Symmetry: none
Subunit: 164 residues, 12 copies
Amino acid sequence: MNYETLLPLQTIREHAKCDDNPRVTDTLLSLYREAAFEAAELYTGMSFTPQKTIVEPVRIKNRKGKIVLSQVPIAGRPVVFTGGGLGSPLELIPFPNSNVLHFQLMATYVAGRRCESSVPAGIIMGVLKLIAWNINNPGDEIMNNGAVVSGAQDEWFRYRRVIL
Amino acid sequence: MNYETLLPLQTIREHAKCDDNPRVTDTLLSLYREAAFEAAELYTGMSFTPQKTIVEPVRIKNRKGKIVLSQVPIAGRPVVFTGGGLGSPLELIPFPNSNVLHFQLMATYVAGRRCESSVPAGIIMGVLKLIAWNINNPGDEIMNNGAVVSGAQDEWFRYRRVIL
Amino acid sequence: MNYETLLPLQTIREHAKCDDNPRVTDTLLSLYREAAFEAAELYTGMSFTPQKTIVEPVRIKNRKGKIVLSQVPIAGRPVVFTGGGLGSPLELIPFPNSNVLHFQLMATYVAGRRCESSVPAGIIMGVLKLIAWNINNPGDEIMNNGAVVSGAQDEWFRYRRVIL
Amino acid sequence: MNYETLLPLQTIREHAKCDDNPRVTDTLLSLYREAAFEAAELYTGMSFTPQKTIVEPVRIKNRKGKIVLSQVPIAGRPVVFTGGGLGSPLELIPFPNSNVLHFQLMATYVAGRRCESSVPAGIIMGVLKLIAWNINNPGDEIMNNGAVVSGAQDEWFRYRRVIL
Amino acid sequence: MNYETLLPLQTIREHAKCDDNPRVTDTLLSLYREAAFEAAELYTGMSFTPQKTIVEPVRIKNRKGKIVLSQVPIAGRPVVFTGGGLGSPLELIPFPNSNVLHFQLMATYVAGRRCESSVPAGIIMGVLKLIAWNINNPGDEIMNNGAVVSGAQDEWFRYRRVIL
Amino acid sequence: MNYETLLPLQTIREHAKCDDNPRVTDTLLSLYREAAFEAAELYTGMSFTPQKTIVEPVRIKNRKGKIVLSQVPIAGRPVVFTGGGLGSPLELIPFPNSNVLHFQLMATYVAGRRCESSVPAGIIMGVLKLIAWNINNPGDEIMNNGAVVSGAQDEWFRYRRVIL
Amino acid sequence: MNYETLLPLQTIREHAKCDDNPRVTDTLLSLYREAAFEAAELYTGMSFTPQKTIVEPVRIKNRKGKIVLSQVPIAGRPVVFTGGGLGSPLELIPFPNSNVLHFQLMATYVAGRRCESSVPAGIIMGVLKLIAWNINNPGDEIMNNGAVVSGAQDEWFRYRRVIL
Amino acid sequence: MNYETLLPLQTIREHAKCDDNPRVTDTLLSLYREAAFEAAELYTGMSFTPQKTIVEPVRIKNRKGKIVLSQVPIAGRPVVFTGGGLGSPLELIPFPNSNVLHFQLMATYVAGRRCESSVPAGIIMGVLKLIAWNINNPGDEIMNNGAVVSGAQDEWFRYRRVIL
Amino acid sequence: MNYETLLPLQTIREHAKCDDNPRVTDTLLSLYREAAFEAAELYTGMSFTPQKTIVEPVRIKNRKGKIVLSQVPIAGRPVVFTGGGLGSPLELIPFPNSNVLHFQLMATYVAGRRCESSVPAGIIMGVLKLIAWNINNPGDEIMNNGAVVSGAQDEWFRYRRVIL
Amino acid sequence: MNYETLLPLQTIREHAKCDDNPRVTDTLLSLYREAAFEAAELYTGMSFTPQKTIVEPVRIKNRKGKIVLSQVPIAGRPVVFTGGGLGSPLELIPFPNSNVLHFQLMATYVAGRRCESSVPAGIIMGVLKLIAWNINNPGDEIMNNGAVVSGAQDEWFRYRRVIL
Amino acid sequence: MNYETLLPLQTIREHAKCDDNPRVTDTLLSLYREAAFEAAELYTGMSFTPQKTIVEPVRIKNRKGKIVLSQVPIAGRPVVFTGGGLGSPLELIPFPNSNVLHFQLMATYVAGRRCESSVPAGIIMGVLKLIAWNINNPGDEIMNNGAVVSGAQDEWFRYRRVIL
Amino acid sequence: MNYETLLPLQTIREHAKCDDNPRVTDTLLSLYREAAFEAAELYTGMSFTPQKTIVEPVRIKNRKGKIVLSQVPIAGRPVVFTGGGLGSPLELIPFPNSNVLHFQLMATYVAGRRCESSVPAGIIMGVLKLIAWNINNPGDEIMNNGAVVSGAQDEWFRYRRVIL
């Protein structure tokens, strides 16, 4: 993917205060950038521009009618349901920024984002901190996890929406 | 967005005493300003300039007749109800600084600000400290939770409406 | 408000001992003073001469008829209420230094305080301390609220009279 | 108030050893002196030389007839109570350092001092220490509760008269 | 009062290691002396040479007929008590150094000292210690109460005589 | 495996900045790389990517019919079951990220990774960190659990996925 | 007084190694000596040379007839009792070594010491140590309870041997 | 066994960074390597190629017939039992990786393994650390066991089969 | 008593490494020795040669007739009792090393030793330590008793070994 | 005995880097070697090369035939019982690695080692460390339990085997 | 006593490094030696030089017939008891190193070896250490119970014979 | 005894590493050697070459027949006891190293060692450490028993065989 557009090398170099470097090659930094983006993906679950189709074997959690989805659905668009003898389609309006719906069973929806320009800035701010840490810690001495001490995880934490 | 009118780059540079450093280009300051304003909006809950129309579904929270909405409406404009098979749309005056309801189903309101001069000074003061912190410490050393240690977050606490 | 009449910049400079600062211009010091006065007013509640009006809906609290408004009405002319089923409004005299009144219903009033020169010395001293602290702390600390550590909030405490 | 008679500027300048310093103008010293005397008045609760005479409502605390005063009446001559259905005005003499009298209801008496030289020296000594602290520490360092650490709020404690 | 005879300036200067001081003027030392004497009087209640007339309303303490007074009357000359239902005036001489007597009402008496020479040396030593402390602590340095750390209060403690 | 394709020696030499060092020959770097990759494989349990469908033995765990598989099936391609006493084919949709299925026994499903570039960058970062630690610390000092203190172990914890 | 014969100034100066010092006059040293002997008398309770006849009131302590006087007795002149139910002074013989009388009412005895020579060496040593402490430390630094820390007090403890 | 085939001495010299040692000759490095491989074998239990025959007596264990042999037979080749008054010898196939069989008696068997090529990398890495630790600690410094502190025993732990 | 016969000054000057002192004259050292020997006598209870007579009254103790005298009579010579309404005087033999006898009553006796020969060695060492401590602690050192910290009271303890 | 064939002096000197030191003669090194081997034999319990026949009395520790013997028997030769009124001497096979068997009375056996080449390397390493410690620490300082702090003891622990 | 035969001054001078120091004359060293030997005798209760014969009274401890001696006799010749109703000789020999015998009463005995070699070297060793401590530390410093910190009272503990 | 053969002076000097001493004479080291050997004697209880006879009474312990002796009799020749048993005096040979036997009563026997060459090396190693410790510390510095910190007691501990 064109990570260059999401975060240029020049900005990374400027933030890290490493635009005068005798041995750190761009080829290596292009690996740290991808690693940081993958780490953010794993920590938050918010995919970038490439949208992904979701069809999964949903289930009912309890008699209250609670259904848990694996990922948040595309915002605004209703979500459809089918299967279990219900030949006709069925759909409801989902909650924004949530993955709980109410009435073998089957359901479908799409997850992803419009494009490079819709990424919240806080994600980038945490990512840049993570790259800076990885640049200034090849792994020779202790001076304990990298993604936490660098503070990027705290920046990303604002979006993980723990129960209120 | 016109973040420039809210906090011109000149003031940010003057506060940080870095107007002559070529290491901090305009784009980096723009990114820092955007991230700081986003963090302030998330923390204090005060929606910024845009006046976005908001529509989202609801479920009857309790048997007593309580329902909750996700964002704060602007005072004056009633919150209206539509759909859900009910008798007919209904209009309610919003309780300022609250989004709780008193008597699938739908409702909608507006959130935002009419004028940009209404920004309290404390928010700008905290944003200045946060940007100053981000300019100096890239997070690659331990001597990193900028929002807390920089002191910006505590300034905004005056408005986070602790329960009296 | 004309804060310059209450605290000349020269006085602030003589207090903080910053009559030679090589980078702190007056345009930033004025913002500092504005923020400090806002913080003091919010903490103590001793507002100034200018006035503002508000309108809100209200709900009775108990069978005894105690009612709570969102802001303190001016110490003076009546506070008006409208609606409530009855065909004509009802009005009560608001008790000063309080937001509580005694008996949907809509309420309106005007906010503000009395003559300009009401400011005592302690608040001025606290504001000076807060400004002095703010000048010498753009935010860097491993060696945490500015108003608490600086001691200003201990100067203003004499006017709160907390009953637990 | 006319503090010039109670504590000449010359004594303050001599105690703090700043008579040759041009960076502390008469305005700033006047502000510090006024603030210090205000703090002393708030802490110990004795109004100074001006022979203030008070008229305050009083209600019997309990069936035993205890009545508590908000100020200590001048010793040696009676304190009078009126109103409250009394057949005729009645006046007694209080026990010294006692603010409680016992065998609508209104009470009046005179509280003050004859000559300014009777202003107890401890109060002036505490004011001097507070002013000296204020002049040297603007409040932007951690080497700030001036009233305490300087000792003035301890020098004044002799008078507050906790219950024996 | 004749403080110059109770404790001359020369002795105070010699004790505190002062041959000649660059800025400490005698006028300020004269204030320190008076402050120290007032502090001693407040801590012990032992009024100096000027004998004082005392009149106050006395009461009986307990079932045992115990009687207490505000100050110790002179050792050998009676106290008087009349009014409040007494049958005839009667004056009696109290215990030595103990304000305890045994079987509105007003009682008066005289307390004080025979002459200047009656002052025990310990009080003078404590006053000298307190003066020395005050000369070397204008109130600007922390790294607390002056009268205790200086040790004068410990010297005076020998005469307060808490119950045995 | 042919590790030369996964991680060329050039990248290791660049990250550890030892391309000009003649004391670390290719033979020793091969050993270090092999050991690091084997350690990662043992830890996360994700054998690397010769693309491979999965068919493995299983035995039922309890009356509920729960059966535990080894690796995560891919999304959108149903598993199929055989073995035991079954006489007809059967296919069920797997739950995302799951490794347990319920209705000797046989069954096969499609999973794994296709291209070597899909090897998540986190694993490569962990391997690089472990190799960098091994290069500089032979293991005879206390200023030695290399996998942990170097942080390589922490980078691999994102995958082991303790029960939710 | 006779303090000169008990402890000549020459010995004190020799002990304190300050004979050639013009910075401590004779009057101040005499004051130190007087204070030292006063403190010693208070602590150890041994009345010094000046004999005094004592006449003090007494109250019956208990139903057993016990009565306690104020000061320690010297070998003791007989005691005459007056007041109460006795028409003429009731003569009786007291006993030394205890302050208890056991077969308003008056009692009497004598106390003191005939000669200086019996002052034990321990008292002199303690007085010397206390005077040496007082000469050097004026009481304005901390790193000040002279009677205790100087070690003088512990020397005198040999003679008390309290019974608890 | 031919340890020089598994780990060339030059490899050890390169790992420990001792390619200039002034007094560590090869006749001692051979002993160090011999000891380290023996320690690894005892810890992990993975033997080395050469086989050896063993004969031992046994004692009747219990009813269920679980019998423990002092060593692990090789590859499950038959293990014979003789003597003890049995009618004729009986033989069983021993379960590999264990020394327990299911049924005075005598037992004999042979122990060993197949080939050198089946040595994983982790064991080699641990042995290298153990040798490096041994070289630089001849036994005259305190800075508890060599195999533990050096971290070698933390490399072999991956094969010791804790109970899942 | 003639201490010079028991301990020459030269012995002190040799022990305390003070055979060069130009400030510690012999007159003060003699007083030090005089005090030290008296302190040793008080601690050990072995009164010295100078004999002294004593006369005292005694109260009636109890049924068993054990009576306590204020001092220890001289061993082996009668102790007399008189007065107390007895028909004629009664005399008893006093038990040595004690002040208790077995039966207002008056009592008389005498105490002392024979001569100076009754001094063991350890007492001399204790006295030497006490004197050496006293010389080099004039009483202005804190950067706690003299006789205990010096160890002399640990030398004399051997002669008590009481049943404590 | 011929300790030379087990550990030549040349190897010890090479390990301790003292081959050119004339301060350590051959006799001292022989003494150190003998002491170290004795300590190892005592600790690990492995009887060394010189074979010896042992005859000692026994008393069964329980009531069901528990035999216990002082030292471990050597493999092959049965332990033979003699005397004790037996019908005839009886022979038992030695259970390896133990001296407790299932059955005044007498028993005998033989212990030792067939050849010197059977010494494990770990014993030699521990002996070398202990000798190195003893060479460089005579035991007159504290930074002295050589067997433990030198690390030699822990090397031998591999063989001591715990009771399970 | 004639200590010259037990420990010549030459040995003390050689051990205590002071064989050329003129300060420590013969008298002071003899005093130290005598004090140390007396302390040793007190601690151990064992007179060294004379083979003293003791006659002491004995009272039966309890009906068991236990008698406790004060000294330890020798194994081989008896200890005699006399007095009471014994009409025939009665003398026994106790357990070695035991001071208790199992059956007014009088006892006497003598034991020990021929010569001064019964003054074990340990006692002399302790005396040397105590004298060495005494010579160097007069007791006016802190870094003082010499008998302990020097180890002499620990050296003598071997013979104290804890009461088993 | 000719200790020279047991441990030559030269070996002691070489071990304690002091063959340059300017003041430690051989005569004093000869005393140190004897003291160390006595200390070993007292600690472990094993006598040296001189075998000695023992005579003492032996009271039975319990009905089980357990009897104990002061020292271990020679390993192979009998202890004797007269009377207290069957018709003839009887002597038996004891357990190896265990002073426990089983069936007036005076019993005697011999104990000791064959020759000077039978002393285990560990005893010599401990004695050398104790000698070095005694040489280093004459008793002045404190840097707590001398026989333990030296480590000799730990070396001797292996032979003291605590009770099981």
